């Protein structure tokens, strides 16, 4: 699916990402946008032979197993294909386990290159939430 800015904002909010581990909602909307361009079926093979999956680009080497990846720790205990749905529940729940580890949101490179230190509350100003 390709979401709209406020459409996504309201759904991340329904799943509890507003202020999850103190990251305001706009942080999440902004990272969906520079990771997947709001497209839930986004998939990107990475030089190390792993693939990033779904709207928050969760990686198969650590977070989900997809069969094809050398060393899959599968820490979210999820099939990577579960992340290509249009129901964001499983991509959110694993995002909650990624952001509770050490680096918070810095896990996502696009967030800490395009969102961190900008007015991310702009991604939700205008939405009915």
């Amino acid at each position, epitope marked *: 699916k390709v979401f709209g800015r406020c459409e996504l904002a309201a759904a991340m909010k329904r799943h509890g990402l507003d*202020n999850y581990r*103190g*990251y*305001s909602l706009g*942080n999440w909307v902004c990272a969906a946008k520079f990771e997947s361009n709001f497209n839930t079926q986004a998939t990107n093979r990475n030089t190390d032979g792993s693939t990033d999956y779904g709207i928050l680009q969760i990686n198969s080497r650590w977070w989900c197993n997809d069969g094809r990846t050398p060393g899959s720790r599968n820490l979210c205990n999820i099939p990577c294909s579960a992340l290509l749905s249009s129901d964001i529940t499983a991509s959110v729940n694993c995002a909650k386990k990624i952001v509770s580890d050490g680096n918070g949101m810095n896990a996502w490179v696009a967030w*800490r290159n395009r969102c*961190k*230190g*900008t*007015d*991310v*509350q702009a991604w939700i*100003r205008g939405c009915r939430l």
Partner: antibody
Amino acid sequence: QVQLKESGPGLVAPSQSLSITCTVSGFSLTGYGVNWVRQPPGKGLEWLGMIWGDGNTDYNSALKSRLSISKDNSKSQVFLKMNSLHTDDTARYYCARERDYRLDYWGQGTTLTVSS
Amino acid sequence: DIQMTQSPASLSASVGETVTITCRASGNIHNYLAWYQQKQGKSPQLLVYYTTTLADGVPSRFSGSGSGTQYSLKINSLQPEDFGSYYCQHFWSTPRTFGGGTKLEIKR
């Protein structure tokens, strides 16, 4: 360990211009915005302006013509310049770190007295 | 722009009392409210952000509340170390504005 220290000129004459530096240590200026707040002796806090991690700056509506903010990322330095000073800008001037819509680390302050 | 109306200006209460401070906004600020405590001649320090979250290291006797335009800071069983000034600040767009302050003072 996050530190914000501001350095001003202490006393300055009315109608001249003021530059205060705020040097930071412990975070990169690219990733956090820094605010400038000030407190007149025996008065509340007043927001002056900010510069976001990406360099965009915002200001108090009413002091917009007099304030100008900028920063040198390399140097870890934010700069505040006021102009057309009046005895009313006699206050303690603080810079604060902003980390996702809360000012979480403040500096000690620098007092500025504007007198002839 | 949005202005904050803090109330009361000053408040006398005994240690162990439970006090409640109030900020009212001229617009919906959508829970982007922070509260700062300032002790005698010290830099303010962050207490509650995004309306209800206690900052790192802050005690459980402190609790933020509100939505839209009416926000509150409740302090329960006041300690000696809680007297001083309290400021709210909104964070909905720029410019940000602080309320006036509430000076919590020891009743005697």
